[PDB]
Design a protein around this ligand. Structure first.
Ligand SMILES: CC(=O)N[C@@H]1[C@@H](O)[C@H](O)[C@@H](COP(=O)(O)O)O[C@@H]1O
Ligand SMILES: CC(=O)N[C@@H]1[C@@H](O)[C@H](O)[C@@H](COP(=O)(O)O)O[C@@H]1O
Lengths: 243, 243
């Protein structure tokens, strides 16, 4: 049950919205069962129903809750289906979903090649390697953290405008060769404290750890990326044939 | 950071082995850094170096640890790669890696079809559906928990001889039609208390939640399975194409 502090400067409706949000983040409210009623909340904390109703309606207007007639109010659990077999960019993914892709830069460095990285990319050593770490956003909501390693010569000099747009698009134009094939490795994990803060989920929340090596049509590897995708807003789908 | 109790009837070497195991399963120990030396352990707990050596040697022999001539003793992180595009059985997967597949029956129930399950499987409603829940073992080590829903008339009566062998082999045999295609949905999760106890991992440890819907060559779906796969023993690998 929530913790409501009436002597706090923070308005009670706001407390409710945040506690509820926090409760949805740590799973204490699942999407199969309805929330306590307006009346139950009010009586529980000795507060007005209109205060409860203000918090709940705001959460409905955010799309965090929904009202099913005669059944109650429920936690919304929108999932995107990520097709694993089609090589696409984040930008392409969002557009196809009628959503607006965004990025926030966590870190950029141009780093020295290592024998490990050069063997993965089949690039030169010593060489310079873009290391691009971004939060990827969908309608301003963080969906993933990606850290992409790209040999300098396959991208040339990069600036903030590149980071704010599509790296795959730049890659195809800069190289005049299409992006063709990738290998991905998937591991379930728990969000670190840092990953959780950036993603707006709980410490330890479920995430998919993804390692991708991406290739141009001519067989050249241009990317080795490691990423963390939110478990709570993604389902990953693929198909299998016999033989 | 182990806990050693000298007045316990349990021998100290056994405590060390168990405490270290518990540490490897809660992440206190990591495969990157060397374990503390015999000396560090012995001095810390006020015990014999040969008691420490006995525990560490046992763990090496169990595969849980390995030694390195100049760097010291390390945590083994053996992970299987699970290829995601060929449709195969557990039994097939384990044989391919030269491991012995096994099963322990968690529960079997013949259940009434639900409208939900009937839509998924495209089977009759009312009808009867096998609900087969097994721990799947690799050399007697729990790898996964699977709960497979199979329409009764696609498998007939089932007994412990079926549960202890390959369901997919039985499915092909019984129907005289081979398995051909599947859809799979992947989701990162944390092991529930019950899932963790069965898999021998920590409560809340990372697992991949997998939903598989599997089809015969004639297009009939014979299986809807929900599974939990151990994060600590599995890497999921697939390839992508630009299409
Ligand atoms: C899990 C994964 O590896 N996802 C890739 C990412 O590695 C790649 O860098 C990004 C480029 O997107 P962009 O073209 O929009 O910058 O597309 C995908 O999100
Ligand atoms: C994640 C997943 O869906 N795994 C399937 C499982 O659904 C199927 O029931 C089992 C049959 O194996 P068997 O033929 O050895 O009994 O093979 C695979 O492990």
């Amino acid at each position: 049950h929530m913790n409501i502090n009436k002597q706090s400067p923070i308005p009670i409706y706001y407390q409710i919205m945040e506690q509820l949000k926090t409760q949805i983040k740590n799973g204490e409210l699942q999407p199969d069962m309805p929330l306590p009623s307006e009346r139950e909340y009010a009586e529980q904390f000795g507060i007005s129903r209109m205060t409860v109703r203000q918090a709940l309606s705001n959460l409905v207007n955010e799309g965090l809750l929904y009202r099913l007639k005669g059944r109650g109010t429920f936690v919304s659990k929108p999932k995107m289906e990520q097709a694993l077999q089609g090589l696409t960019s984040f930008t392409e993914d969002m557009k196809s979903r009628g959503m607006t892709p965004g990025s926030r830069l966590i870190d950029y460095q141009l780093i020295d090649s290592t024998e490990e990285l050069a063997a993965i990319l089949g690039c030169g050593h010593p060489s310079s390697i873009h290391k691009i770490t971004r939060v990827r956003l969908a309608n301003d909501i963080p969906m993933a953290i990606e850290s992409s390693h790209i040999p300098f010569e396959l991208a040339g000099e990069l600036n903030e405008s590149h980071f704010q747009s599509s790296i795959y698009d730049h890659i195809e134009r800069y190289n005049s060769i299409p992006i063709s094939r990738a290998k991905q490795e998937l591991e379930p994990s728990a969000a670190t404290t840092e990953e959780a803060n950036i993603l707006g989920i709980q410490k330890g929340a479920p995430v998919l750890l993804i390692k991708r090596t991406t290739y141009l049509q001519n067989g050249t590897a241009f990317e080795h990326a490691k990423s963390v995708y939110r478990g709570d807003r993604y389902t990953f789908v693929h198909y299998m044939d016999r033989l």
